[PDB]
Design an enzyme around this catalytic site. Structure first.
Site, mmCIF file in Angstrom:
data_model
loop_
_atom_site.group_PDB
_atom_site.id
_atom_site.type_symbol
_atom_site.label_atom_id
_atom_site.label_comp_id
_atom_site.label_asym_id
_atom_site.label_seq_id
_atom_site.Cartn_x
_atom_site.Cartn_y
_atom_site.Cartn_z
ATOM 1 N N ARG A 124 -27.286 82.595 79.178
ATOM 2 C CA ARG A 124 -28.139 81.408 79.225
ATOM 3 C C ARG A 124 -27.291 80.226 78.768
ATOM 4 O O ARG A 124 -27.306 79.855 77.592
ATOM 5 C CB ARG A 124 -29.385 81.585 78.360
ATOM 6 N N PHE A 129 -26.316 71.229 77.130
ATOM 7 C CA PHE A 129 -27.603 71.410 76.465
ATOM 8 C C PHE A 129 -27.585 72.606 75.526
ATOM 9 O O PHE A 129 -27.840 72.445 74.328
ATOM 10 C CB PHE A 129 -28.719 71.555 77.508
ATOM 11 N N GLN A 132 -26.539 80.061 75.244
ATOM 12 C CA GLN A 132 -27.193 81.074 74.428
ATOM 13 C C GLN A 132 -26.676 82.462 74.784
ATOM 14 O O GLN A 132 -26.634 82.835 75.960
ATOM 15 C CB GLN A 132 -28.709 81.012 74.609
ATOM 16 N N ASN A 171 -33.836 81.514 70.974
ATOM 17 C CA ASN A 171 -35.021 82.360 71.032
ATOM 18 C C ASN A 171 -35.335 82.757 72.472
ATOM 19 O O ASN A 171 -34.747 82.227 73.414
ATOM 20 C CB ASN A 171 -36.221 81.644 70.410
ATOM 21 N N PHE A 178 -27.355 80.081 70.140
ATOM 22 C CA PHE A 178 -26.979 79.083 71.133
ATOM 23 C C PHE A 178 -25.978 78.101 70.541
ATOM 24 O O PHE A 178 -26.194 77.569 69.449
ATOM 25 C CB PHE A 178 -28.209 78.331 71.647
ATOM 26 N N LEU A 187 -34.841 69.719 71.780
ATOM 27 C CA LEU A 187 -35.138 71.103 71.442
ATOM 28 C C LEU A 187 -35.224 71.336 69.940
ATOM 29 O O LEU A 187 -35.370 72.487 69.515
ATOM 30 C CB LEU A 187 -34.081 72.033 72.048
ATOM 31 N N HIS A 191 -35.569 75.524 67.998
ATOM 32 C CA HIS A 191 -34.339 76.262 67.740
ATOM 33 C C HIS A 191 -33.682 75.676 66.499
ATOM 34 O O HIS A 191 -33.388 74.476 66.456
ATOM 35 C CB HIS A 191 -33.395 76.194 68.940
#
Lengths: 223, 119
Positions: A124, A129, A132, A171, A178, A187, A191
């Site tokens: 991910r 951005f 993860q 998550n 991340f 975010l 997170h």
């Protein structure tokens, strides 16, 4: 000034490094061609002016009592994009802000819990951005397990992803973590940011540039 | 009051498509379209052989041996202007085949840990 900067000796080991220095108390060789030997006493710590360029497995290892060859735990993971290394992200996981997530990232790098970031991949990854990974069960961010079980709560969101190399617990935070290469204040509140790579920020930028089009996996990792 | 849409006319069943009347029926219709009307009553006053003439037991087996029962709905179904589109009951708490394929979820979704953490 009891620590050395012995280089020029990956085939070496801790016993072979400490056999020439034996009363060395600490001997932590880096993943590159460098090691540091520290003696507890004062007369035994002057090995730089006494056994310089010592033969270590048919190889000379020059020893200098300095810190040229190189609290919050640092997850030092050689994150490799594909079959080549994209850099050694020495992400200093912020134990002052989120100590549970920082210890989870440090243990995932050190692979002391049986699974973690040493050998896992980041499936991910977004452009500037988030990136993860750390999920060693499903390898997509949909698996993973923390120390308290499959899912664990975030420790604290005092830190923020305000720059490159900032690490957060992805998550609700299990084994997913991340790394952020830019501002991620949208975010925030979901997170918990638990790191800031003072070293390996270029490795985090390379991971963000590569992210997934390539298998970005830290095969070698540690504390 | 549909009034602004167009629909496909028909889809034939599988045994009828396996016999394949549509291909030479379309060929005969296109040949008739390319015919002039002069050719139309010329072929009326002098006809020709061979309309389809494939066999009989292929159509017999399509009607009987290759017969498939369709999906008849319930006794209490009410049809309306919709009543052919609400097939999602896409189960709640269940993903799709495209979400299983494009996200690499084997029969493990990438949002499974987030869904389990949110409960």
């Amino acid at each position: 000034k009891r620590v050395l900067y012995v280089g020029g000796l990956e085939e070496v080991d801790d016993k072979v490094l400490h056999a020439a220095f034996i009363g060395d108390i600490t001997d932590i060789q880096i993943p590159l061609d460098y090691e540091t030997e520290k003696h507890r006493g004062f007369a035994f710590v002057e090995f730089e002016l006494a056994e310089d360029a010592a033969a270590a497995i048919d190889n000379m290892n020059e020893s200098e009592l300095f810190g040229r060859t190189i609290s919050n735990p640092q997850v030092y993971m050689d994150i490799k994009i594909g079959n080549k290394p994209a850099g050694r992200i020495q992400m200093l996981l912020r134990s002052d802000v989120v100590p549970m997530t920082a210890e989870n990232f440090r243990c995932l790098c050190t692979h002391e819990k049986g699974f973690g970031f040493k050998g896992s991949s980041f499936h991910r990854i977004i452009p500037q951005f988030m990136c993860q990974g750390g999920d060693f069960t499903n390898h997509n961010g949909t698996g993973g397990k923390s120390i308290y079980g499959k899912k664990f709560d975030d420790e604290n969101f005092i830190l923020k992803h305000t720059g490159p190399g900032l690490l957060s617990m992805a998550n609700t935070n299990g084994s997913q973590f991340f790394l952020t290469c830019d501002k991620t204040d949208w975010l925030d509140g979901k997170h918990v940011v638990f790191g800031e790579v003072t070293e390996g920020l270029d490795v985090l930028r390379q991971i963000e540039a590569q992210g997934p089009k390539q298998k970005v996996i830290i095969a070698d990792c540690g504390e | 009051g549909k009034r602004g849409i167009e629909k496909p006319p028909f889809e034939l069943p599988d045994f009828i498509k396996r016999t394949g009347i549509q291909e030479m029926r379309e060929a005969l219709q296109e040949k008739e379209e390319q015919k002039t009307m002069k050719s139309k009553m010329r072929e009326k006053v002098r006809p020709k052989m061979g309309k389809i003439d494939i066999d009989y037991q292929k159509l017999h087996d399509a009607f009987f041996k290759w017969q498939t029962k369709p999906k008849l709905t319930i006794h209490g179904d009410l049809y309306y202007e919709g009543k052919e589109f609400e097939t999602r009951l896409k189960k709640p708490g269940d993903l799709s085949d495209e979400l299983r394929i494009s996200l690499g979820m084997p029969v493990p979704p990438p949002w499974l840990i987030a869904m389990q953490r949110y409960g």
